[PDB]
Design a binder for this molecule. Structure first.
Ligand code: CLA
Ligand code: CLA
Ligand code: CLA
Ligand code: CLA
Ligand code: CLA
Ligand code: CLA
Ligand code: CLA
Ligand code: QDL
Ligand code: BCR
Ligand code: LMU
Ligand code: LMU
Lengths: 196, 94, 67, 158, 199
């Protein structure tokens, strides 16, 4: 049966030996295998960026440098100059930041999609696995599962960050945790869910 | 701030993007998009003014870069250059 | 020689596009056994058409037997 | 208040309209004997008018610059008595009527000449189906769940 | 045994008497379809047990306080009191705790025996039973699920549902609680009825 919903039948196109398949596909968006492979790749790509982004949202706020939202305010000021760890960035000019980012990232992401092997498309080797951990396929698959799980848990956390930011303008992630710890029985989602 | 530098830099970056970054995608999507009417191209159907010009399309560049491509990416270069050159004195525009 | 067509009393479904009872059902009355008859199946219906008729003739490939 | 409107219990134009109507009625009342029937009818009309204005005032309606009540239908919880609750009543009654009609048509279609039962009603049968509209929202929902409400497109034909 | 709610009336054909509490009562033909019958059989037990619990916990505190051993508000005012947590927190806790148990109950109605397994400790499950009447942990003293006891449960539940409806309606006209209404009826039986309430 379906692992995500105990007592529920598995989908016809699912139940295969996939890294993270729990039989969850209510809308049946994965009927065509050619769409399914690219959905797997897209899932891996969203997971990795979210996992890499979570510390980048939690660390500067915890170091007293401004939450992840206020760090983008200097770009909206005409004379705004970038700062990093309190050290002003000499090249903090907005046009060059918007230019070199596009110019470099376009090439860096154009290179990766010229690959034609679907299995190697999700997981390349070479200069991306320096220490090397594919020596044992069983532990390789185990690590793949333990990676996709943390990636889904990280995407959930980022969406939570966005929604909690929208609920309390001007605040940060860890500030909400501190407020919750201050008054557990009075500071919860109940006020927003049931508004006064 | 200096137009004679901004325009040159923008044109150079646009030409680099055209020749080395998005060349394959453009040249492979172009092959699949040929206008036709009732299963035949415009020149095959009878239009004598729809012949594709041959002199201007050939080039000795290793990848086939030509004059039409030069103009296509140079136009982007000038447009972006004058976009940056306008929202500097005072421009609140998208 | 085997008798052609469905037996009397069979329920059939109409496939002729320009017929009033298209996609409806009717009852077989009789089948003409002459090999030269082009439309040999006689069908009767509960509802009359715009001309007030409630029976019509059809070919063997214009009717489907529904069980 | 809402949309620049004023409560009718605090509107000067509303009170002016009430006074004008009462004066117009009293002018006619002053033409007949005090104990005659027309005088009593006019007095009853005057009392009814005063009651109507008082009830409109104390039921929380809003009045415009013209001095007439206006209705709010955007969903605001201070005005559900204006559209939402009567709307629920209208839907309940209409569903009852439609449900009993459909059930009669389905129950009668199994006969030899169903049309004869459409110009001459079988009251004995209808009197057993009429009380069942009392729970039409449950019956219709369960019928929808089990696939008995709708006919497939392939089966539709004369 | 199978009685009659109206002496002199014929019973429906689909109420042959295979269910506890059968008395041939379905004038409006809600349960003609077999599946509707199962759905309503479950719903009756659930609404009835909730009504029994509500009536007990809605009436006992009132008489306890009126006796003089406690000081608690009426049932229609307890939601406007001072508690260690706000009402919103309690509602959210209730919603989260109930989504899980109610979908767990739903999965067993959809197909019996599907959710008998313990999710965490993979060593406990529910032996075969009938929907609406589980056992094991839910029957600590391990009583006997005889036909007599099921009828005794159903009768009290059906009584409790009407009692709760009566409380709800009597609060919206009098506004003094159940026990005060009963003592008022017992003071002057011929001058304190529903007729005097509206006039
Ligand atoms: C964008 C990220 C992303 C993508 C592309 C995929 C893709 C895939 N997932 Mg994964 N997944 C994700 C995020 C993603 N997942 C997250 C965040 C979780 C945790 C909740 C999971 C949990 C999960 C499980 C448990 C399983 C999968 C599976 C699958 C596969 C089948 C389903 C499908 O066709 O999805 C295609 C998806 C899309 C085309 C995206 C549609 C988005 C719509 C248009 C809007 C959604 C808005 C959102 C609901 C708003 C509220 C968010 C809030 C609740 C956080 C497929 C390879 C199944 C599998 O077999 O994997 C191998 C499987 O068992 N995923
Ligand atoms: C997903 C990747 C990602 C992205 C896009 C960003 C983006 C940003 N980070 Mg963050 N960061 C990330 C991951 C990321 N970070 C991670 C993984 C960590 C943990 C090591 C941090 C730790 C971190 C710190 C400690 C700070 C930032 C800051 C910044 C901002 C200034 C960057 C700059 O001027 O660079 C210029 C170019 C180079 C450094 C080269 C910018 C909004 C700064 C900020 O917001 O200051 C207000 C800042 O102080 N980041
Ligand atoms: C060649 C045509 C042209 C010229 C000479 C100007 C000139 C001017 N515009 Mg206008 N404008 C134009 C086209 C033009 N505009 C177009 C096509 C748009 C639509 C996007 C606008 C939208 C626009 C806005 C919203 C504003 C101006 C403003 C201005 C003034 C300040 C400079 C500036 O920011 O320019 C605007 C520069 C651009 C729009 C860059 C265009 C970039 C490419 C070519 C297109 C977009 C990608 C100046 C009088 C500003 C002002 O305060 O005026 C009083 C101002 O707020 N323009
Ligand atoms: C597209 C137009 C539109 C729609 C579909 C709605 C829909 C709704 N509005 Mg309204 N509303 C609108 C425009 C609209 N509004 C606009 C433009 C305004 C600003 C003037 C408002 C201001 C407004 C207020 C102030 C309130 C609503 C409320 C509601 C809800 C009442 C439903 C209810 O409880 O029924 C009852 C049905 C049954 C019991 C059955 C409903 C979701 C009420 C609510 O509670 O919303 C959450 C509410 O308090 N609306
Ligand atoms: C059993 C009664 C019944 C029912 C359930 C429906 C249902 C429907 N009709 Mg139909 N209709 C009926 C009778 C009925 N109609 C009659 C008698 C007429 C002749 C005037 C029409 C003329 C009619 C039109 C012209 C249209 C519909 C449409 C519709 C649809 C949308 C609702 C609507 O616009 O209603 C509006 C219908 C009316 C206001 C007509 C009056 C309905 C009466 C009050 C019904 C009950 C009368 C009956 C004698 C009661 C018998 C009781 C029984 C116990 C003996 C819906 C499928 C619309 C549609 O196609 O939507 C997609 C549409 O355009 N109906
Ligand atoms: C449906 C079940 C139910 C529910 C929702 C409540 C709810 C409540 N009870 Mg009640 N109660 C119940 C059943 C229930 N009771 C039962 C079965 C009994 C045994 C007779 C009691 C005996 C009881 C007492 C003695 C008291 C409450 C009180 C309370 C209130 C605070 C306690 C709390 O919920 O924590 C709250 C309104 C307290 C209160 O303040 O009530 C007004 C209180 O003093 N309850
Ligand atoms: C079933 C339990 C039950 C019982 C024992 C009572 C008892 C009482 N009710 Mg209440 N009542 C009930 C149900 C009940 N009610 C229900 C279901 C409703 C909603 C229609 C009401 C609505 C209601 C109002 C509006 C009023 C009362 C009032 C009263 C009191 C005066 C008698 C009277 O006028 O009754 C009126 C009776 C009805 C309106 C209908 C009663 C219908 C029930 C189901 C009949 C039960 C029959 C059953 C065989 C009796 C068993 C008795 C005993 C063994 C439990 C009295 C203490 C009055 C009061 O407060 O006086 C101070 C009053 O004003 N009741
Ligand atoms: C059977 C049948 C029919 C009849 C059907 C009928 C009459 C059905 C009637 C159903 C009724 C009245 C159901 C009532 C259910 C009531 C329930 C579940 C009540 C629950 C109450 C609870 C939890 C109370 C909680 C609290 O009080 C406490 C504990 C403490 C307080 O501080 C707080 C609150 C919240 C107030 C016909 C339709 C007539 C024909 C058909 O053919 C056959
Ligand atoms: C590398 C190499 C080389 C070189 C090359 C070059 C150097 C090139 C250049 C090129 C270029 C340099 C180009 C350009 C182009 C341009 C263009 C194409 C432009 C356009 C423009 C426009 C269209 C404009 C418009 C306008 C106006 C008119 C007004 C105002 C506004 C605007 C700006 C919009 C050779 C040969 C030796 C060979 C070997 C290698
Ligand atoms: C925050 C950002 C930090 C960035 C740090 C710098 C990262 C630099 C990464 C450069 C990767 C360059 O890639 C280099 O190794 C890849 C893996 O062997 C090669 O890729 C090749 O080998 C792959 C693995 O066997 C196969 O899919 C193909 O044969 C082919 O794609 C590239 O042809 C080579 O150019
Ligand atoms: C705020 C409100 C939110 C509501 C959310 C819940 C919505 C629930 C929708 C239930 C839809 C039930 O009806 C839906 O499935 C039925 C089958 O089960 C379909 O029924 C169809 O298939 C059945 C077999 O399965 C056939 O016996 C029926 O003749 C055929 O019509 C209905 O044509 C369709 O409309």
């Amino acid at each position: 049966s379906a692992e995500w919903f105990p007592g529920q039948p598995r989908p016809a196109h699912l139940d295969g030996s996939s890294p993270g398949d729990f039989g969850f596909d209510p809308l049946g968006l994965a009927t065509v295998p050619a769409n399914f492979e690219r959905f797997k790749e897209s899932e891996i790509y969203h997971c990795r960026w979210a996992m890499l982004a979570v510390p980048g949202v939690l660390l500067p706020e915890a170091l007293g440098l401004g939450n992840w939202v206020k760090a983008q305010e200097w770009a909206a000021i005409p004379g705004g100059q970038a700062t990093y760890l309190g050290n002003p960035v000499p090249w903090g000019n907005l046009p060059t930041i918007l230019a070199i980012e596009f110019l470099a990232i376009a090439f860096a992401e154009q290179q990766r999609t010229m690959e034609k092997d679907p299995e190697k498309k999700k997981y390349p080797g070479g200069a991306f696995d320096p220490l090397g951990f594919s020596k044992d396929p069983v532990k390789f698959e185990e690590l793949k599962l333990k990676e996709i799980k943390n990636g889904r848990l990280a995407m959930l956390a980022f969406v939570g960050f966005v929604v909690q930011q929208s609920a309390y303008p001007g605040t940060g992630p860890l500030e909400n945790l501190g407020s919750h710890l201050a008054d557990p029985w009075h500071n919860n989602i109940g006020d927003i869910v049931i508004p006064r | 701030l200096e137009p004679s530098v901004v325009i040159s830099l923008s044109t150079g970056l646009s030409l680099v993007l055209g020749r080395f970054v998005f060349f394959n995608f453009q040249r492979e999507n172009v092959a699949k998009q040929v206008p036709a009417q009732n299963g035949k191209t415009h020149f095959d159907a009878g239009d004598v003014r729809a012949k594709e010009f041959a002199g201007i399309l050939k080039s000795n560049d290793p990848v086939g870069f030509n004059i039409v491509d030069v103009l296509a990416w140079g136009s982007i270069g000038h447009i972006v250059a004058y976009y940056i050159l306008a929202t500097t004195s005072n421009g609140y525009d998208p | 020689p085997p008798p052609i067509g469905p037996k009397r009393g069979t329920k059939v479904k109409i496939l002729r596009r320009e017929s009033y009872w298209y996609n409806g059902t009717g009852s077989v009355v009789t089948v003409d056994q002459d090999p030269n008859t082009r439309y040999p199946v006689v069908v009767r219906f509960a509802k009359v058409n715009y001309a007030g008729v409630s029976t019509n003739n059809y070919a063997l490939d214009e009717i489907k037997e529904v069980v | 208040d809402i949309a620049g409107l004023t409560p009718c219990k605090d509107s000067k134009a509303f009170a002016k309209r009430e006074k004008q109507s009462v004066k117009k009625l009293t002018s006619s009342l002053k033409k007949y004997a005090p104990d005659s029937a027309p005088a009593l009818a006019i007095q009853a009309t005057i009392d009814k008018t005063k009651r109507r204005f008082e009830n409109y005032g104390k039921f929380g309606l809003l009045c415009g610059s013209d001095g007439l009540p206006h209705l709010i239908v955007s969903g605001d919880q201070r005005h559900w008595g204006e559209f939402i609750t009567p709307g629920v009543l209208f839907l309940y009654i209409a569903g009852w009527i439609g449900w009993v009609g459909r059930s009669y048509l389905i129950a009668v279609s199994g006969e030899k000449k169903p049309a004869m039962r459409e110009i001459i009603i079988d009251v004995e049968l209808a009197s057993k189906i009429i009380p069942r509209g009392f729970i039409w929202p449950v019956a219709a929902y369960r019928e929808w769940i089990n696939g008995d409400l709708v006919v497939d497109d392939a089966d539709i034909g004369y | 045994a199978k009685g009659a709610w109206l002496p002199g009336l014929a019973s429906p054909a689909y109420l042959d008497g295979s269910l506890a509490g059968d008395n041939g009562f379905d004038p409006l033909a809600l349960a003609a379809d077999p599946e509707d019958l199962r759905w309503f059989v479950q719903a009756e037990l659930v609404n009835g047990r909730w009504a029994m619990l509500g009536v007990a916990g809605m009436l006992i505190p009132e008489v306890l306080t009126k006796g003089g051993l406690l000081n608690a508000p009426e049932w229609y005012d307890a939601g406007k009191g001072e508690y260690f947590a706000s009402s919103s927190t309690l509602f959210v806790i209730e919603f989260i705790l109930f989504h899980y148990v109610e979908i767990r109950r739903w999965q067993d109605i959809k197909n019996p025996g599907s959710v008998n397994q313990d999710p965490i400790f993979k060593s406990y499950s529910l032996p075969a039973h009938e929907c609406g009447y589980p056992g094991s942990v839910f029957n600590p003293l391990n009583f006997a699920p005889t036909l007599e006891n099921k009828e005794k449960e159903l009768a009290n539940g059906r009584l409790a549902m009407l009692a709760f409806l009566g409380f709800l309606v009597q609060h919206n006209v009098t506004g003094k609680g159940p026990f005060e209404n009963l003592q008022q009826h017992l003071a002057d039986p011929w001058h304190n009825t529903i007729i005097q309430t509206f006039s």
